[PDB]
Amino acid sequence: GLELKDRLVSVNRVTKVTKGGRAFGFSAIVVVGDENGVVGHGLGKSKDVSEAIAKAVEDAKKNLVRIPLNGQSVPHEQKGKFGGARVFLIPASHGTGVIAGGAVRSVLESVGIHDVLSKSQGSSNPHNVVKATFDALLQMRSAHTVAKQRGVSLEKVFK
RNA sequence: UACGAUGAAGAGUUUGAUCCUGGCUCAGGAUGAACGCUAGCGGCAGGCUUAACACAUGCAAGUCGAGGGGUAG
Secondary structure, three states: OOOOEEEEEEEEEEEEEEOEEEEEEEEEEEEEEEOOOOOEEEEEEEOOOOHHHHHHHHHHHHHHHEEEOOOOOOOOOOOEEEOOOOOEEEEEOOOOEOOOOOOOHHHHHHHHOEEEEEOOOOOOOOHHHHHHHHHHHHHOHHHHHHHHOOOOOOOOOOO
């Protein structure tokens, strides 16, 4: 899209030990989405916080992905692991709300979902839970897509 | 592009820094509740969870003369 809004999930300070002393450094994770159909996460590493966030959003502006969000939310229930984390997304209604964790909430608000229930029965690492949410969101295929893949009309997949 | 289902949130903490497993704690609801501070009412509900420990005193199961002898009065 064109009206991309960013959201900083977490900023973590790292350190590399050298002969002299401690070499600090800032890492930031930023998810930027059009709030309607497309979203993308990025990682930025620098020495200043503003520079790290700028590098993160500049890297996240690339490799955007399209996600089906039938009606107002996910079409079906889906699991996504990506190693440590384990996210489970379920559609609820058209007025429920986004019941998500700490880092899943930002992704689900940037992709454009407004009523979903997500349970993170796993780790609490912002680096891995965002990618787990992405893996659980990219495996979703809508009714038209499954009907076209099967070859059957869009009435037998319902009846 | 319908059907039913009105329903599921995390965070801190081991390390110079990272990921994982893993334990502790917190954010919510509730009570025959107690304690501290405070204090204007109305409706309704509740009130010895412990010693089935020991009890002063009052009341808590009587009625029928259309069953009977019927007495004081």
